[PDB]
């Protein structure tokens, strides 16, 4: 089963706990999600940008997910992270993916309303949920909340993305996360908080902000930091090694444990059944 | 579409020419192949053996299948390679499957024939073709005519591997082909012949043997060395890489190459429409 | 693509129209209803009982569903009706249905609602959502008519997305005009905001469930009215026709007839070009 | 699982019996057909024409055959009767169907083969079986009485997984007794190796197809006789409920009526535990 996240976050948003999104690119990165999610009892995300379809395209990572919804007991939430436009998102929808998001964050508030308001209509008509952003991840840089409450009241999105400090990538320096802000946009906010650029930021940080309001925390470095470090191990100490059966699992297994972290710091061990 | 190879091996017997039969292991690899096979006009069997199916169950490698069959708009042959039991291939018959191996290679001709029939006999029912091995590769080690004409006639199987000196994996010296044998064996055994171990056989060789009637040419070994090779390289050259996107396309590319090679000396180009 | 009425009847809701459920039994009855759908652009629920799916099992409906799906390129709602238990949900659900309804309302309250809290937690856990009854239907005291504090607490206790509500309607046809209690309805949806359900459609007059859908309701179950008009084109024809046998005909007769019924109810529910 | 008839009619034929084919028309007639198939432990075919998917379309039967497969734990072959053309049959087989009959019978020899063959190459890559037709169907002279040797070559040149043979059999009811050409059949049958094919088998009596199938015939090709079954009954229970209308009645008493007939092919055709 491919499923949508409306129900997932609300359930997140009302048990002080967020789901792991994890971006996935192949077979191998999808299963090592799924035996720790699967031994752990946690809920999951598994989101690809548009750049992830452009290596496997999407209808090959939808069959997959398909099929490990099968072999793992549990409907799965394939997810669309930051694409950009309607007609690709609908190509998307059609070939089955139920929860998307539609990032206008870099354009001004009222062109960012009418490009969400575009997807949000048509997903909503397909039983896809959407996420969009109002801010700029790394002024611009953090969302106002009175502006977040029009934006949501504007567009209809299922879930925000909010701007609060964090960043994509590796951080230089210990990142600084507005706490106070998102306090605030909680309190006026009532869909479901998302936080982007979660790779890197300090466990104690981001339990944080889950307290004070995010139902979903998205990490796609880290992962691949770990998988592809221990493949690049693992053909130093085996120059003539070939057989993915063994190289893969490596990087899984280096995978699987930043996902067990992740799982640990967003408190969604146990959340389903 | 997900097919068994009962008309392929057959054109492929009345036209003179061998398809491919390429083991696989993952999205990569599979789709590393399908961009040459598309663009050349070949067709192809894809291979899993057990241990393939170890890595990523074969539920998936099926559901990639599937979805790849449709996006290079190409019925697809996906085939159980060195498999050894009733259950297991029923298992994945029932899972979709519609090509196998059963290999009872290693029993006495008794024990072979009888394992072998359970196996055709089950499979005929799913409509699933049905190869066989006769002779070991590597007297055990070399098929005899008669016999082979005697295995076939009790088996009913579709296809037939012969042991004529070729061997899985690299040759450590250019290995011997018995040519006479092969000969002898097309005069008396009707269906398509099968060649394993032809990974780092000279193209002439497996070229005459095609002449002489075989129609499958399985190749494994190459695939991985060049895949491995070039992912090896990468990580050597990117010590800090990490993107799929990038490593394991330097290790489809390779792949590829090998792939237009054996499509070359298969004759397989240019056989489908 | 086989969706949840989530969205659907939120849409409905907001714009004052209501969601026609057809209780469907075949291939022929499903393609009738979404003939007139189609050309009316209007959306649609197909609804099956128990009772339906021990004729033409969940399975076949659902697959002719997802067929009819992509034939019509619209996702499609299909509905448990009427349905009991969670097991039976579980299964079809699993199955692949995204619209369920769990009737616990023979029971008291409170069993009431440990049922249908059962089937929300799994189904919502599912992406399905969830439709349940609070009072009995059947026309004119207590038992037959929801109230609206009880309501309030049951909507509130279990997470349903929609309610059936009991206020004067009845399956099958009406000995007389029915009833309606209005005022009830009216005083329901001052207190519960999600999506209100009427059971029991057929054989009630249009003014009246044009009404209800003013005073709240959103999605209409038709099945009675829709099985009259098959069989009684299907019973012309064959006493027009005594040595006629092929299908194709007599089906088609059975399933013009219908299609007058589906577009008399979009007509009543005001989902036309709603799509 | 949907499956060609590749190894089902060479099991058949080396067996000594037959695979009844049916002819269907929605889920009622699939199901009454299974029903019978599955405690019979027999083999089957189910068929549809180019009208019969002009009233329900080949991707909705599709879609419920897939369905009834995994219901019943068999693979099914669905196959396309009585098709006519390359650019129709490509788009059902790839709809997924994997048995077809292109009818090209119509044609002079030539124009036939070159028909056949562009089914047969195409079919073939897409792991489709094909049945195909010489001499033309109807009782009793040359157009309507397959050539033995000219069988022959029709079968070298196009390639054809089945040959439907022409010695007086017609579709629907005789008027009188046909008169079968058993002669001919043997003769047919001692040119060509691949499976035959009967139709018209409805009316013809049970003697008449058991010695057809002593001669070679490897499918038995039955509508007619499933329609007038069905029909009969759902006549029969209109006139005896005037007020009646529930489907899950009429439409079963019509399944049980059509269930004798399946089962009384299936044991002329000998088909009987032979899965
Ligand atoms: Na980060
Ligand atoms: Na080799
Ligand atoms: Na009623
Ligand atoms: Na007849
Ligand atoms: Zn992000
Ligand atoms: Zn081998
Ligand atoms: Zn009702
Ligand atoms: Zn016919």
């Known amino acids: 089963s491919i499923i949508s996240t ?17 971006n996935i690119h192949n077979a191998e990165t999808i299963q090592a999600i799924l035996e720790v999610c699967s031994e752990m009892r946690s809920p999951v995300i598994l989101a690809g940008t548009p750049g992830t379809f452009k290596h496997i395209a999407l209808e090959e990572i939808y069959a997959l997910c398909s099929a490990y919804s099968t072999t793992y007991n ?6 669309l992270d930051h694409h950009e436009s309607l007609d690709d998102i609908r190509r998307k929808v059609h070939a089955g993916v139920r929860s998307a998001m539609i990032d206008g964050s870099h354009f001004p508030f009222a062109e960012n309303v009418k490009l969400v308001k575009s997807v949000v209509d048509f997903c909503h008509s397909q039983d896809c949920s959407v996420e969009a952003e109002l801010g ?45 802000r998102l306090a605030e946009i909680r309190e006026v906010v009532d869909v479901p908080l998302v936080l982007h650029g979660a790779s890197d930021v300090p466990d104690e940080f981001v339990r944080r902000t889950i307290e004070l309001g995010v139902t979903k925390v998205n990490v796609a470095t880290e992962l691949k930091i770990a998988f592809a470090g221990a493949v690049k191990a693992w053909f130093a100490e085996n120059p003539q090694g070939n057989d993915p059966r063994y190289y893969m699992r490596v990087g899984m297994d280096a995978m699987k444990e930043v996902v067990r972290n ?3 710091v967003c408190g969604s061990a146990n959340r389903i059944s």
């Open 6 to 22: 409306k129900y997932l976050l609300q359930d997140a948003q009302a048990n002080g706990y967020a789901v792991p999104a994890f």
């Open 74 to 79: 549990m409907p799965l939430a394939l997810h």
């Open 136 to 180: 700029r991840l790394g002024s611009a840089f953090l969302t106002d909340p009175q502006e977040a409450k029009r934006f949501v009241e504007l567009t209809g999105v299922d879930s925000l993305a909010v701007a609060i400090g964090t960043a994509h990538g590796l951080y230089s320096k210990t990142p600084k996360i507005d706490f106070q």
């Open 262 to 264: 992740k799982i640990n």
